[PDB]
Design an enzyme around this catalytic site. Structure first.
Site, short mmCIF file in Angstrom:
data_model
loop_
_atom_site.label_atom_id
_atom_site.label_comp_id
_atom_site.label_asym_id
_atom_site.label_seq_id
_atom_site.Cartn_x
_atom_site.Cartn_y
_atom_site.Cartn_z
N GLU C 25 0.29 -1.03 0.15
CA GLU C 25 -0.24 -0.51 -0.33
C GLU C 25 1.22 1.31 -0.11
O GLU C 25 1.56 0.88 0.03
CB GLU C 25 -0.54 -0.08 1.36
N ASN C 169 -12.19 -2.60 -2.83
CA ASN C 169 -11.35 -3.30 -1.21
C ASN C 169 -12.40 -2.48 0.15
O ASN C 169 -12.71 -1.27 0.04
CB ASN C 169 -10.26 -2.79 -1.58
N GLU C 170 -12.29 -3.27 1.30
CA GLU C 170 -12.98 -2.86 2.61
C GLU C 170 -13.97 -2.07 2.02
O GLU C 170 -13.87 -0.97 2.98
CB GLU C 170 -11.56 -1.98 2.67
N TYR C 236 -6.79 -10.49 10.00
CA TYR C 236 -5.87 -10.41 10.33
C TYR C 236 -5.30 -11.19 12.24
O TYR C 236 -6.60 -11.16 12.89
CB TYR C 236 -5.02 -8.67 11.19
N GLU C 292 -5.61 -9.91 2.57
CA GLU C 292 -4.82 -9.89 3.65
C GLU C 292 -5.52 -10.59 4.46
O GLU C 292 -6.37 -10.99 5.46
CB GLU C 292 -6.72 -8.93 4.01
N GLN C 341 2.13 -7.23 5.26
CA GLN C 341 2.63 -6.17 4.39
C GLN C 341 3.57 -6.95 2.88
O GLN C 341 4.30 -7.85 3.44
CB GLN C 341 2.70 -5.35 3.72
#
Ligand SMILES: [Cl-]
Ligand SMILES: [Cl-]
Lengths: 490, 162, 490
Positions: C25, C169-170, C236, C292, C341
């Site tokens: 990112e 995304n998101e 996560y 992710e 990442q």
């Protein structure tokens, strides 16, 4: 050839013996000349139940019997079938002779004689909540109450035990034409009042989908999963349109392939319905229960269509064989199945005519496969030859169990009527070497059936057409066969 | 409203002055004398499914059964014929104050158990809308159309406020 | 001991190499010191991309890279990152510096240099339909048009190829705080205008659930399944409360067990989400894409919390190892995964400080496991020792692949830091006998990490602590190990 490996040391679960279950109704002479003949019948009987049939069902090791089931469940008022047999209610159409001589006491007795589990469906469609509640009280309550005291007057002192209780059947259809959303609300209500008396523990079963009504399954799990121990599923194997299904014998080669293709659809249904149950019940608490399956043909010519009398070919045996295999493959969720029906009705194991009875090909399969009841499924991996006119179907269906006594059973169906079927079987995870007996069930004709005149046309024979090279077992299956091999270690 | 007329149920109060002298037999007879069709509405609101089912048995069944035998004791040997059977009336109001969604589920259930005996063939009728409850009509057709032979409608002509 | 069988002849499917994917990112020094340094930086670079990192990622065989991904995707306007680098848009918060020197051309070039697939997420939240449409034109269109001609002015003559295109995304969060019902309508609309130019073929990917929003998955499949090639998922591994997550090093033994327990929850999520996808997509056409995942700790003390800089212990390697195993087990549906990442940010494979870089333990796992990329999963059956303070966790996680060249790879994680782990492995289905090399990755401390001063504290070593009795392979795994065995037939 068709390759098969059997990881003989890898148990994949238990085949609940209730998969080998049956189901009977009061539409026809299933419960009226087929089984119940009456205490005062010339046919040799035990308390009204003909002994030729008892003997045969005991031998088959029937695990569970479902009554009333089908449409009758949601028409029946159980109080009409208790009390003095002489003075019970009596419905009779002169165009139907329902005398209610076979009721709750008679059924419980039957299950005790057979050594099978009783499975009863209460009436949601046309019944009330108190009615169903009282039925469970009547049967299971050890204390003092109108219902329990009435059970004793009627001749049973101690309560009975019953596990499997169906809260309606066929409620999308002849049991009320209910929407799922709606049956679910009733299910929740009714089941509330079915209590566990004494040390009886109820397995409450909600009416599930017809065929591919995945919507029904979705709704029932979404709305009622917490309140049910099991969920039912209904799928008959019908060769033709519902208006002209096709005959039990004298059918085309097309009708053979189509019949089996329809039968095998069971795997898709079970998979897709299980998929949905997984979403709302990931740990698979709730049993899937296929309490209606089997072939449905047009009735034998010159019998009443409403009586549902049909014959039973080697075709019928293949369907039974392959479908049971499918349940095996799904025993993580599927824990009971009930073929339709027991005697003289649809895909019956037995037919009768006066004091004569025969065993159908379908009987022979249930008898042959009883080695799988409460057995342990074994990891089997396979690559099978295709058959049928488009290469549609598998030539072979195969399954492996480990009995309690350590012995190993391997059942095999050859779906090609036209030619035999070669099967190399590698057995891994063994202890010693092993020896192997074998039975097979086959026929000369595609519609090979048993009649009262020649009742032994189609019966199990010894099977010796295989070499066993301590490790590999190459085998040579007859056309339209159902075959069980029994392996002993050492 | 069946059985010996002298020993039938009786509600009476002028704080309903009903003696049930006119019941099923009396009505069916009337329709025979007039040469008109009978049209009966069964009880959904406060009735049960077996109750309604048995009413049709009682009237139309040619064979041998508690209901049919009871019809004969009560003085009618042969069954009657009836086409038009209403599965409740006024169910949005004095017949249960039902939502359409809900009456529709009951309609479907009840009608299931109204059988054609002998060569009697029933014309099953669902309770339809009051006046301009187009919603009711929409729901009943959407949810129950396959299970009905007819759908009712109620509209009185009232000059003034209720 | 821990028993394991490997049916070495039973392929269960293909492990899509895209499972070994990564994601970056415009977040910290991920794209800004970590990868992009610029043409005339003192750090040795190839067209602005530092070669130390290229070299290491080429070695690791990075299969796919996702950019922009995360929140940035739905803030980005792609036209801001094309044109003369000299005259591109410039956003700067002085409280964080975006100069847009790294844009579309730079990224596409990067993927060409790495030999990895590009995976781009367009902007739904704050973007328009024509904007996204034009991005695809710009990249893939071989003909003559404002966008294509603009690509050529900007220095790329032929189009590029791209498969993986994320349509937002998101979107439940920082990408619009959308309801699923709503995102689904936008998804359908946007994807309509993303055309396949030349012989480019797009793999359209819809934004999937956060963690256990099974509702989101249900709705997206119900409303949009036909219009997507894939569906994403985000989870996560966070040891503590979101407000106080816990540190990357100097953590308690409790924080070790909790970290792994959180990591393993991935299996439940993937299972339950897959379950739902199965309902609406029984044939599994649609890829599940876990774009992710990875550990999320508190930033190294006295660094900017908004930059998300964190270290990388042997703990981080265990998580990576075990999670990749979980994807293996789910390769029927899961076909891409992207750890968060790539550089200097969360669970990175590489950290940098000026021209110095190190390989994290996490790098070593991706490098060690690359033998599984596009390999074939093998039927493994196992019974494993429990570990951890409540017997919670498995002591061992293990997986088996068959590379293209016939070789067999078996990866093993020992999750107990306190003691080594015994593992008997029976290998069936073989032809010849086999020989076996071995690598292992372990540590002296539970927070064993690599620093710029000592960047080789924790690296793969040869592994020889196992006997191979030409069939059984007994093995003796170090505490906090990740281990790969390579077997050659003959
Ligand atoms: Cl059992
Ligand atoms: Cl690929």
């Amino acid at each position: 050839a068709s390759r098969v490996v059997v990881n003989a040391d890898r148990v994949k679960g238990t085949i609940n013996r209730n998969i080998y279950g049956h189901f009977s109704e009061h539409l026809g002479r299933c419960i009226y000349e087929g089984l119940w003949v009456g205490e005062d019948s010339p046919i040799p009987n035990t308390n009204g139940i003909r002994n030729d049939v008892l003997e045969a069902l005991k031998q088959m090791k029937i695990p569970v019997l479902h009554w009333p089931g089908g449409c009758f469940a949601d028409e029946y008022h159980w109080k009409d079938g208790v009390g003095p047999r002489e003075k019970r209610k009596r419905m009779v159409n002169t165009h139907v002779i329902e005398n209610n001589h076979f009721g709750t006491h008679e059924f419980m007795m039957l299950c005790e004689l057979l050594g099978c589990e009783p499975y009863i469906s209460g009436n949601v469609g046309s019944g009330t909540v108190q009615e169903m509640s009282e039925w469970v009280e009547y049967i299971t309550f050890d204390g003092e109450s109108p219902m329990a005291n009435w059970r004793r007057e009627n001749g049973r002192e101690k309560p009975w035990r019953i596990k499997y209780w169906g809260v309606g059947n066929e409620n999308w259809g002849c049991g009320g034409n209910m929407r799922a959303e709606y049956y679910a609300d009733l299910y929740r209500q009714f089941q509330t009042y079915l209590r566990n008396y004494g040390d009886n523990k109820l397995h409450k079963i909600a009416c599930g989908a017809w065929t591919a009504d995945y919507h029904w399954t979705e709704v029932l799990m979404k709305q009622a999963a917490p309140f049910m121990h099991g969920l039912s599923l209904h799928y008959y194997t019908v060769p033709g349109p519902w208006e002209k299904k096709g005959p039990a014998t004298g059918f085309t080669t097309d009708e053979w392939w189509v019949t089996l293709k329809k039968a095998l659809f069971m795997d898709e249904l079970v998979t897709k319905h299980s998929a949905i149950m997984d979403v709302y019940d990931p740990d698979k608490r709730i049993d899937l229960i296929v309490d209606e399956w089997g072939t449905w043909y047009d009735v034998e010519p010159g019998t009443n269509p409403g009586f549902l009398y049909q014959q039973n070919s080697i075709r019928d045996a293949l369907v039974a064989g392959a479908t049971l295999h499918i349940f095996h493959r799904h025993c993580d969720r599927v824990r009971m199945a009930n073929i339709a029906q027991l005697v003289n009705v649809m895909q019956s194991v037995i037919l009768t005519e006066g004091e004569r009875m025969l065993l159908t090909p379908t009987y022979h399969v249930f008898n042959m496969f009883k080695v799988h009841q409460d057995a342990e499924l074994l990891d089997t991996w396979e690559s099978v030859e295709r058959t049928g006119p488009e290469g549609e179907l598998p030539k072979v269906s195969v399954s492996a169990s480990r009995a309690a006594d350590g012995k190993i059973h391997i059942s095999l169906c050859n779906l090609d009527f036209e030619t035999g079927a070669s099967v190399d079987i590698e057995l891994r995870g063994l202890n010693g070497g092993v020896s192997a007996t074998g039975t097979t069930l086959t026929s000369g004709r595609i519609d090979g059936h048993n009649t009262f005149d020649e009742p032994e046309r189609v019966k199990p024979a010894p099977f010796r057409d295989f070499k066993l090279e301590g490790g590999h077992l190459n085998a040579s299956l007859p056309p339209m066969s159902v075959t069980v091999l029994e392996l002993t270690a050492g």
